[PDB]
Each structure stands twice: as C-alpha cells, then as structure tokens.
From a paper:
Legionella pneumophila, the causative agent of Legionnaires disease, secretes the enzyme AnkX that uses cytidine diphosphate-choline to post-translationally modify the human small G-Protein Rab1 with a phosphocholine moiety at Ser76. Through crystal structures of Lem3 in the apo form and in complex with Rab1b, we reveal Lem3’s catalytic mechanism, showing that it acts on Rab1 by locally unfolding it.
In order to obtain structural insights into Lem3, we crystallised the full-length protein comprising the amino acids (aa) 1-570 (Lem3FL) and a shortened construct (aa 21-486, Lem321-486). We solved the structures of Lem3FL and Lem321-486 at 3.6 Å and 2.2 Å resolution, respectively. Lem321-486 differs from the conserved PPM1A fold in minor details: The central β-sheet core consists of two additional β-strands (β1 and β19), thereby broadening the cleft. The spatial orientation of the additional α-helices forming the thumb shape a deep cavity located at the interception of the fist and the thumb (referred to as the hollow region). The base of this hollow region, which is located closely to the β-sheet cleft in the active centre, harbours the metal ions. As verified by CheckMyMetal, these metal ions are embedded in an octahedral cluster which is characteristic of the coordination of Mg2+, Mn2+, or Ca2+ ions. This metal cluster is surrounded by a scaffold of oxygen atoms provided by the side chains of four aspartate residues (D82Lem3, D105Lem3, D254Lem3, and D394Lem3), the backbone carbonyl of a glycine (G106Lem3) as well as six water molecules. More precisely, M1 is coordinated by D105Lem3, D254Lem3, D394Lem3, and three water molecules. M2 is coordinated by D105Lem3, the main chain-oxygen atom of G106Lem3, and four solvent molecules.
Numbering used by the authors: 20 to 148, 164 to 330, 352 to 363, 377 to 485
Write the structure that this text describes.
C-alpha cells in the first residue's frame, strides 16, 4: 500500500546463557522481522533484549516505524512522511505497562503520518490532547526547487542522510539530558509541549535532497550497538551519533551493487549492529565466569564495559542481573528518481497517458537517461507479503520485464520524434 506502520509484536526472548552458543544467523532469525513498502522503503524491527539467566516470555517491542508515500495531482509519487518511535520505560515484565507504552509509541507514529501539514505544524497538532521519543521527516518535490526534506528528532533516535554512493551528507543527532546521579536519558515528544526551551529538546534541519539519496532512521537499539561518537556536551545536554568513518565502512559491500533495495541496506546495518550486540553479551557472561574463578587482556575487557569507588559485590549483582539489548528498529528510504516515478505512473495508470505524455520532455535529457530509468525499474524487488520473519523473506520483480521493454520502445520512439 501507500501507508504502512509496524504492528504490536510480542516475541519469546531466550536468556544470554542460551544465546551464548548461538551464531549471528540464529540470533537474528528468532528476533527480527522485515516490513516492506517497496524497493525504496523497508523496515527491520525486533528485540535484542535478554536477561543473563532468565527467558523473557512476553518481550513486547515498544518501537514503532511507519511511512505514507504521497503523490501529486496526477498520482505520481513525489514525496513521503516517515516516523520511527521508541516508547520510554517498560521491559520489566508488566503487560499492562507495555500495552500503555506501546499505545503512545504507535499513536505518536500514526498521528505524524495521518497529518497533512509541514513538520513544525504537525509536531504542534500531535503534541496536544507514558512517553515516546520520535525521529521523523517529510520530503516533497517542489517543481522549481527539487526535493526539500524537513527533519525532526526528539530523543535518542538517529537520522543519517547519504548520497547514492553512500557518502554521509547530514546527521540529525541523538540527544540525552542529564537527570542527576550520573544518568542521561532522552527527551520525549510529549515533553516538547511542557517547556519553552523546545530547541534544547527538538533537533530540526531542513535540507535539499538529491535523487537516489539514502535516509536511514534508527532507534538506539540499532545505532547504539555500532561504534558511537560524542558530538557535543553542554551543562545538561549531550549530542550523540555514530562514528561516521565506521558507519561509512558498513556499505563497502554494496560499492558495486547496481541498485540495492532499502531491505538489503537495512539488513547489512542490522547484521553488523546485532553481531556486535551478540559478541558483547558473549564477552560479559564469560568475564563474569572468569572473575568468579578469582574467589575473593581481561583488565581492558572489564574496563571497556564499566567505563563505557563501587564495592565488588554490588558490581557482580549488577552484571549478573543486568538485561542486555533493547527494542531495535531501522527504516531505510531512497529519494525517488523523477523519471522513474513518471514511468511507474504511466505503466500503472494507462488511463492518464494524455496527461503524463507532456511531462516526459522535461525529465528525459537523452536515450541513455531513459535506459538508466528502465534499468533501475528492472532491478526493483517487492515482498509480496508486507511482513515476514527476516530469514523467511521472499522477493519478486516489481514489473514484468516484457512490460518495461514494450513501454521503453514506445517512449524511445516518441523521444526520437
Ligand atoms: Mg524504549
Ligand atoms: Mg531504545
């Protein structure tokens, strides 16, 4: 469809003691789902959350992600609204608490998509009559200007904008506020209407976007497992994101991938994030068993966990009773090509062939550029089921090759005239 939003998901979360013998493949397969809109927008959603020695029977995913694809008056795709939310609190083993937190997480996301206003007006309408952080954006083609993207981040979500060669252009950074007693927690969408200092909480950027730009939104469950970087710290505020050099290396794979799906991009980041998460939790329980041998290298390992006077007994209780991981969600969007979307509309809506025919002349500089457009459309893949387990993904061609070839021949003939 044009509108897709993740549904309430309750999974069985095995303990670290059970996951400590499992490979990455098994860990991902039991914990993550693919929610697909098209080749150019996909969601991966799941939970890496685990107790050291106890299984979590009802592990409710408190993250939501959603998209509404928008069209011009002719029905040609020209924009989208995208939101990712992280419900604050929960994961304690109370279903009533998790249900309440999920309702706010989901409605926050849903309300953002259903609003038809610019981002600043949208945030005002959905923040007036349980907390959730939100990272969200609106892009739209403005005939004179091209694509303009409005970006909003409240809390510890993260948005990264790349070009078509996976060069990092912009980052809408995560935020933590100091709460006292050495603890930093993200602001919520709901906190925005309770204070005059909306800047201190709301990160806003308005950006010109190019065709084929990649926008990645992640909850801290995904990007927090990658190598992180402190961007800035004031008195009571921290600006945090991914190490840009490390994040760039994640795409080394796709360097020669002709037109990679949003799914493939999301999968690669999710795999690396959960690899580090799985190895992190392997190390912890083995270190715990290693420092139980003491009976009161490893030093740099023990140092790395704690620092990124407390009595030994308290630390061990902490490490042995600790939950690891979190609700982990990522959405990936490709900014559409003007020519590709006009061709999509021409094929899907052959009734509107007269109205669309005049628009091709402006969007076709050469036959080479037409061939480029039909090449991208040739490579588009869709998940016939909107949702399925990440390891049970089945993808088929968006178009019949024979349909694309006949349309290209017709359009090529008319260009050559
Ligand atoms: Mg949360
Ligand atoms: Mg989170």
């Amino acid at each position: 469809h044009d509108k897709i939003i993740t549904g309430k998901k309750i999974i069985f979360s095995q303990s670290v003691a059970k996951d400590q013998t499992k490979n990455l493949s098994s860990f991902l397969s039991e914990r993550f789902y693919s929610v697909n809109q098209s080749h150019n927008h996909s969601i991966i959603i799941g939970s890496s959350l685990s107790h050291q020695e106890n299984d979590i029977e009802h592990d409710t995913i408190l993250d939501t992600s959603g998209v509404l694809v928008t069209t011009d008056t002719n029905g040609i795709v020209n924009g989208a609204r995208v939101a990712i939310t992280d419900g604050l609190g929960g994961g304690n083993g109370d279903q009533e608490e998790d249900d309440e937190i999920y309702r706010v997480s989901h409605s926050s996301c849903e309300n953002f998509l259903n609003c038809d206003q610019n981002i600043d007006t949208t945030l005002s309408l959905i923040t007036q009559p349980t907390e959730a952080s939100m990272a969200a954006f609106i892009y739209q083609n403005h005939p004179g200007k091209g694509y303009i993207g409005e970006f909003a981040n409240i809390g510890a979500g993260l948005i990264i904008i790349l070009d078509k060669r996976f060069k990092i252009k912009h980052m809408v950074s995560a935020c933590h506020i100091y709460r006292g007693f050495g603890t930093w927690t993200p602001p919520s969408l709901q906190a925005l209407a309770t204070t005059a200092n909306k800047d201190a909480l709301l990160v806003r950027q308005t950006l010109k976007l190019a065709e084929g730009d990649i926008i990645i939104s992640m909850t801290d469950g995904v990007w927090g497992e990658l190598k992180t970087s402190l961007i800035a710290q004031t008195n009571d505020r921290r600006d945090i994101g991914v190490d840009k050099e490390y994040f760039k290396t994640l795409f080394d794979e796709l360097t020669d991938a002709p037109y990679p799906s949003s799914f493939d991009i999301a999968r690669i980041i999710t795999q690396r994030a959960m690899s580090r998460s799985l190895e992190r939790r392997k190390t912890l329980i083995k270190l715990i068993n290693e420092i139980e041998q003491q009976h009161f290298e490893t030093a740099q390992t023990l140092k790395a966990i704690l620092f990124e006077e407390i009595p030994l007994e308290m630390v061990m209780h902490d490490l042995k009773s600790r939950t690891v991981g979190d609700c982990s969600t990522i959405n990936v969007t490709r900014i559409p090509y003007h020519l590709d979307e006009l061709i999509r509309g021409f094929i899907n809506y052959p009734e509107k062939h007269q109205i669309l025919a005049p628009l091709f002349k402006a969007r076709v500089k050469s036959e080479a550029d037409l061939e480029e457009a039909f090449h991208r459309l040739s490579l588009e893949m869709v998940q016939p089921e909107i949702e399925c387990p990440i390891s049970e993904t089945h993808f088929e061609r968006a178009f019949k090759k024979e349909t694309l070839d006949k349309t290209q021949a017709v359009l090529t003939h008319y260009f050559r005239i």
